[PDB]
Amino acid sequence: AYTTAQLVTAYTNANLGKAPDAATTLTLDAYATQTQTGGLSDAAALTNTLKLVNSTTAVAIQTYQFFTGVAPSAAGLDFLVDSTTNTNDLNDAYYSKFAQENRFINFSINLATGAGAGATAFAAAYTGVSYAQTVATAYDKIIGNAVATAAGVDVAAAVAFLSRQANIDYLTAFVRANTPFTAAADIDLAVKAALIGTILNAATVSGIGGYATATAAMINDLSDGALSTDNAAGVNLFTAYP
């Protein structure tokens, strides 16, 4: 049985010091009183609280891992998610009109195709490969192929959907309008980045797959105020949370 004042601290630390909106406070309060009456277990209530921190936090953990091979340190996360120093950060004014999806896509393009940390590596790895293959291989890296089938979702139908011509056309226009790229190679390269972003979203929303399960456990550890692993130059998800 959690007091509503415990669920707010659990939410605050997950959001790295951003105190929840008036609306969500009411949501948390419901989760509290549903545990006092035994209509909800303890672990269940805490999971739902941390599900609300998806857009703000999970966006920074997951993308950093996929592109740079390592999730950001606690100190680093602070900077990306909720800080005094970064004027524009994930839970700040700049981003208040981006949905969940467009947040993932934003982060991806930043890290991948720019002067971002992942540019040089991602540029060499995904050169001269087709849209179809980009999606198929990435799907398996993130969500697993065996895991998805056991979970009951049909892989083939999903991969086909992501790589259909209509989808690719939509992104091409999107990337051309938004990003300052004009070269034919860089646009091609950025579209792939946006696709992987779309997959990361699709993963974190369903809870299936290796990436999603590890990120969940990192946020759980981050909940109580202190991050146990907290290597100075980044925490590799798959090492730390088996």
List contacts with its own copies (CB under 8 A): 1, 22-23, 25-27, 29-30, 33-34, 36-40, 125-129, 133-134, 137-138, 140-141, 144-147, 209-211, 213-214, 238, 242
The reply to whether 81 sits near Ca ion by the rule CB under 5 A is: no
- 26 touches which of its own copies, Ca ion, none (CB within 5 to 8 A by kind)? its own copies
The reply to whether 228 sits near Ca ion by the rule CB under 5 A is: yes
Cβ at position 129, least distance to its own copies in Å: 5
**C-alpha span between 184 and 78 (Å, rounded):** 36
**C-alpha span between 179 and 175 (Å, rounded):** 6
Which distant-in-sequence residues (6+ apart) come within 8 Å of 18 by Cβ?
Answer: 12, 56, 81, 82, 91
The reply to whether 221 sits near Ca ion by the rule CB under 5 A is: yes
**C-alpha span between 136 and 235 (Å, rounded):** 27
**C-alpha span between 238 and 233 (Å, rounded):** 16
- 147 touches which of its own copies, Ca ion, none (CB within 5 to 8 A by kind)? its own copies
- 228 touches which of its own copies, Ca ion, none (CB within 5 to 8 A by kind)? Ca ion
Cβ at position 86, least distance to its own copies in Å: 26
223, 229, 232, 210: which is closest to 65 by C-alpha? 210
The reply to whether 99 sits near Ca ion by the rule CB under 5 A is: no
φ, ψ for residue 62 (rounded to 5)? -70, -45
**C-alpha span between 129 and 20 (Å, rounded):** 43
Which distant-in-sequence residues (6+ apart) come within 8 Å of 114 by Cβ?
Answer: none
The reply to whether 92 sits near Ca ion by the rule CB under 5 A is: yes
- Closer Cβ to its own copies, 11 or 126, answer by number: 126
Cβ at position 10, least distance to Ca ion in Å: 12
The reply to whether 73 sits near Ca ion by the rule CB under 5 A is: no
Cβ at position 180, least distance to its own copies in Å: 27
Cβ at position 37, least distance to its own copies in Å: 3
- 157 touches which of its own copies, Ca ion, none (CB within 5 to 8 A by kind)? none
- Closer Cβ to its own copies, 63 or 106, answer by number: 63
Which distant-in-sequence residues (6+ apart) come within 8 Å of 107 by Cβ?
Answer: 59, 60, 63, 197
Cα dist from 26 to 57, 200, 219, whole Å: 21, 29, 22
Cβ at position 225, least distance to its own copies in Å: 25
List residues near Ca ion by CB under 5 A.
Answer: 17, 82, 89, 92, 221, 224, 226, 228
